[PDB]
Design a protein around this ligand. Structure first.
Ligand SMILES: [Cl-]
Ligand SMILES: [Cl-]
Ligand SMILES: [Cl-]
Ligand SMILES: [Cl-]
Ligand code: NA
Ligand code: NA
Ligand code: NA
Ligand code: NA
Lengths: 67, 67
């Protein structure tokens, strides 16, 4: 099957943090994570982005190999 | 506003080629482009992917700068 584009750094962060985020409803948990992404340190941001970049490089290689 | 994730190489190709693709309906034009992406040369594939990678690097920088 066609390789799948990996999740962005911003979406990895929102998803990974959602389950423990709190409080009151899924809407409210999402709202707070989106705030938390905004207030990450530069070095934490940098780490999320580097991990996503690595996954994107793998995806690029897979597209080029894909039959 | 929040930086927008750039379009993937595969989606750039499908979109850019759609208008002149032919023939008979939008569905059929899409179906044919998707076929054409599959049969690109390695070097043409490589070029699309490098252009998308450049846009993704710019997006990474913009996220890291974004206030
Ligand atoms: Cl990203
Ligand atoms: Cl990607
Ligand atoms: Cl891509
Ligand atoms: Cl990206
Ligand atoms: Na830091
Ligand atoms: Na990963
Ligand atoms: Na080639
Ligand atoms: Na571009």
């Amino acid at each position: 099957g066609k390789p799948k584009r990996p999740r962005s750094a911003y979406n990895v962060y929102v998803a990974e943090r959602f389950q423990e985020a709190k409080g009151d409803s899924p809407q409210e948990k999402l709202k707070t994570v989106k705030e938390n992404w905004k207030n990450l340190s530069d070095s934490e941001k940098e780490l999320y982005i580097q991990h996503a970049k690595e996954d994107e490089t793998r995806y690029h290689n897979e597209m080029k190999s894909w039959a």
